[PDB]
Ligand binder design. Structure first.
Ligand code: SF4
Ligand code: MG
Length: 548
């Protein structure tokens, strides 16, 4: 018997930092949360069956990453979509089971690999069962490690999805996803074995971020130094949000010559840094701030909005008629832009709607500079190294990650403003919006905020650090003049954290709170072995991270 209507604690904003049990803080309703649990459960069973067969296939690999992405915070609020995804997994699982060479193994299989439902009512009943809840794992340390691994796997799945959209893949990462999912169903594993899998999850997060970096840069060019306008023009626009650059490619192609401008929002900002998008005259600039302001900013934008990934907030009535979903995003009543047989998407109706809209309300004017991904920073290596050797740059501070609504996040704005003028902030992901419009200036022409791109472009920050480690002949990445004060919100940030731990980064400050899914004993290991700490006050953290 489920002790509460739902249980979800996978993001930074979980209620009281102990768990959403009646309705999600994000707006995810109990029935949706329980259906998402059943979707994860169904994916775990599908992984068990594929591991029994000994191999997977492309349609199953894509399904598994897409189904996991469907359950990431702020992606899909639509119970109908989640039910359809559950049924798709059951059909793929039954297909796989029909190809089994050892079907006598059925009775030894965990329930997630064999459960069935003969009706939508039986699906809902199963979704409401205790066995599909996150709380089904009874020991709190085993639960903590399984959930941490699972959320790291969701983050891998999101980034892998984007690589696959662009025609890139790595079947070893999919093999790891299945292995990890199976492990969370395996009561024979010890906590040490789960701990090893969490570390291996960081290794595969590096590999996945490397693959997505290859996909984005081979397709659209290497990011380069770019000034991005944050004001508006006088034409109707379409605002594109989330992370998917292929969606933008098609939107820009289809709006060329139409009189409809295109603007980016939140994690679409880094598209401006890629040469393939810079080429379009009607690609205007970046509108507003990070995802949590979107109810106000999407209304002010006046034109249609295309949400390619998270973060989607349950929309205000004022713009519900002009916000569209795509990819795995969903919300009841929002129309979707589906892929055709080739993965092409048709924005014609969004464009015809945009022609009838007022132009965007100006929220601000000016320009921000960005595009300091790994190729661009490597081209500046002599200048960066010279600034380090002279002490013009005494310390880099990685403040990358993912913003959110909690006002405690003011810490990051105040921290950025109080840093001394001989430090440089390295950023990526929407955490940047706490400090990327502050006018912090430059050090000998190197901006004091260096934006490498989306949260996945934390990969570039790791590559830059590893290059500086090589240049300075250090044998420990932590011997660089670098500090980490990272903000997190959902599961892609968890995968980024694990990647950093796997790469050997110690003493990360993680905030503005520590995840609810760390049990006391698990958090103890992160503190004592990896040096993780939470934020305190700006002055104390400036002192410990910068001046000592
Ligand atoms: S995704 Fe976050 S806010 Fe939403 S229900 Fe889960 S823990 Fe709560
Ligand atoms: Mg519905």
């Amino acid at each position: 018997m489920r002790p509460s209507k739902m249980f979800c604690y996978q993001c930074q904003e979980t209620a009281k930092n102990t768990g959403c049990t009646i309705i999600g803080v994000c707006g995810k309703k109990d029935n949706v949360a329980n259906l998402q649990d059943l979707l994860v459960y169904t994916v775990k069973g599908l992984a068990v069956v594929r591991e029994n067969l000994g191999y997977s296939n492309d349609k199953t690999d894509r399904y598994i990453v897409d189904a996991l992405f469907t359950t990431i915070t702020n992606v899909n609020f639509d119970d109908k979509d989640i039910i359809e995804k559950i049924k798709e997994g059951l059909a793929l699982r039954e297909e796989a089971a029909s190809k089994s060479t050892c079907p006598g193994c059925g009775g030894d299989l965990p329930d997630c690999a064999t459960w069935t439902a003969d009706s939508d009512d039986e699906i809902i009943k199963k979704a409401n069962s205790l066995e599909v809840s996150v709380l089904a794992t009874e020991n709190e340390d085993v639960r903590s490690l399984r959930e941490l691994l699972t959320y790291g796997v969701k983050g891998i799945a999101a980034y892998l999805h984007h690589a696959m959209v662009l025609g890139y893949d790595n079947k070893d990462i999919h093999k790891f996803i299945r292995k990890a999912l199976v492990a969370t169903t395996d009561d024979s594993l010890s906590a040490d074995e789960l701990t090893a899998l969490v570390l291996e999850c960081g290794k595969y997060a590096v590999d996945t971020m490397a693959l997505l970096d290859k996909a984005n840069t081979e397709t659209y060019g290497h990011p380069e130094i770019t000034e991005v306008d944050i004001g508006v023009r006088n034409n109707p626009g379409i605002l594109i949000s989330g992370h998917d650059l292929k969606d933008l490619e098609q939107l820009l192609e289809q709006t060329k010559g139409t009189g409809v401008d295109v603007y980016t929002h939140s994690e679409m900002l880094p598209a401006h840094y890629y040469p393939a998008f810079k080429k379009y005259d009607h690609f205007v600039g970046n509108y507003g701030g990070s995802w949590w302001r979107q109810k106000e900013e999407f209304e002010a934008f006046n034109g249609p909005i295309v949400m390619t990934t998270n973060c989607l907030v349950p929309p205000a009535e004022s713009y519900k008629d002009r916000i569209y979903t795509t990819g795995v995003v969903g919300f009841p009543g929002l129309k979707r832009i589906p892929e055709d047989e080739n993965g092409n998407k048709d924005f014609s109706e969004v464009i015809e709607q945009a022609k009838k809209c007022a132009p965007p309300k100006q929220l601000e004017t000016g320009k921000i500079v960005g595009g300091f991904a790994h190729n661009q920073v490597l081209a500046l290596a002599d200048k960066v190294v010279e600034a380090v050797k002279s002490g013009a740059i005494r310390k880099f501070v990685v403040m990358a990650g993912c913003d959110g609504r909690h006002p405690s996040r003011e810490y990051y704005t105040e921290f950025a403003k109080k840093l001394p003028n001989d430090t440089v902030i390295l950023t990526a992901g929407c955490a940047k919006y706490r400090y990327n419009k502050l006018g912090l200036g430059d050090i000998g022409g190197i901006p004091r905020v260096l934006d490498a791109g989306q949260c996945n472009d934390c990969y570039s920050l790791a590559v830059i650090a590893l290059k500086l480690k090589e240049v300075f002949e250090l044998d420990d990445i932590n011997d660089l003049p670098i500090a980490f004060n990272v903000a997190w919100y959902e599961q892609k940030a968890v995968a980024v954290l694990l990647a950093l731990l796997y790469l050997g980064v110690k003493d990360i400050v993680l905030g503005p709170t520590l995840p609810a899914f760390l049990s006391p004993n698990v958090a103890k290991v992160l503190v004592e072995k990896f040096g993780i700490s939470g934020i305190t006050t700006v002055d104390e953290d400036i002192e410990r991270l910068i001046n000592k």
